[PDB]
Each structure stands twice: as structure tokens, then as C-alpha cells.
Amino acid sequence: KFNDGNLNIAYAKPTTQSSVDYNGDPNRAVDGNRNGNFNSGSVTHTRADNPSWWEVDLKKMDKVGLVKIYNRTDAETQRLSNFDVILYDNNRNEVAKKHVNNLSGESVSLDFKEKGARYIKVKLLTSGVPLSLAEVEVFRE
Ligand SMILES: C[C@@H]1O[C@H](O)[C@@H](O)[C@H](O)[C@@H]1O
Ligand SMILES: [Ca+2]
After folding, report:
1. Given 2.60.40.730, 1.10.260.40, 3.30.160.20, 2.60.120.260, which CATH number is that of 1-141?
2. Which ligand 1 atom is at minimum distance from the Cα of 74?
């Protein structure tokens, strides 16, 4: 629930994703565990979807600052590439979007500067690539 003294508002929130494979249910990206080894149980996994995506629902409009996305680490790390992070309001209107080409480390940090949003979606832009996320943390600043 807190990471380095900052309240992670995504923790334990409802999640969905495009499909599930390998029992990589979407709630694994909000289970409080940054472990990126798939075999740990901490990491989501969709099927090879058109495209694969994952989303957290904050349950109401909230304010979104830092969003930190933790990649799978044990294998297939390149899958988390060429992707959008999209904020939606209560009526699923897009209110902000950032594109990430790839990760040089195990995570990427994005600052949405306190934009009002209820949903944060991670969407791969390449057809037929599974989406796996170790953790998605969201902070209000
Ligand atoms: C859980 C599995 O891990 C393996 O390393 C991959 O080759 C499979 O595609 C799948 O992601
Ligand atoms: Ca996790």
C-alpha cells in the first residue's frame, strides 16, 4: 500500500486484461509485489491478443501523478515494448496518453502531473504479443 512513503492507490484495486494465460490473472500487477519472475506468482500474462492490454480501475475519479510499471524479469522481457499508457475518465474518455518504446531497466516511470482519471490502461501496440506486468503502482503526485 505504501512504497517509499508514497501511497500506492492502485494496490488491491479491481483489474482486468484482454485475456489470461498461464494463470497470470490481472490482479497480480496490484498485489504489492514487484517480483518480476513469472514463476513467483507476482506477474500477469495475457494470451497473444490483438492487442494485449491490462487495466486498473481506481473506482472513482482520482488524481494521477507517478505511474511506475514493473516488467517481467525472468524471460521475454522485450514483450513490454511499443506500448501506450492511457488514462480514462469516468465515461471512458481518454484524458491522457504516453507512449513507451522500450525499457532500459526493469521498470519505467511516467508522470501524469495530477490528471484526473479513473482507469489506467497499459496497451501493447504490436499484435500477437502477450502482455506481462510484474506490478503497476500509481501515486497521486
Ligand atoms: C510463462 C511462459 O514463459 C516462457 O518463458 C515463455 O516462452 C512463454 O511464452 C510464457 O511466457
Ligand atoms: Ca505483482
Report:
1. 2.60.120.260
2. 5
Phi-psi category of residue 5: left, alpha or beta, with phi > 0 → left and psi -120 to 50 → alpha: left
3 in Cβ contact with 137 (< 8 Å): yes
Rounded to an integer, what distance in angstroms lies between the CA atom of residue 67 and that of residue 7? 12
Residue bearing the CA closest to ligand 1, atom 7: 76
- Per the entry, the structure determination technique was X-ray
State whether the beta carbon of 38 lies less than 6 angstroms from ligand 1: yes
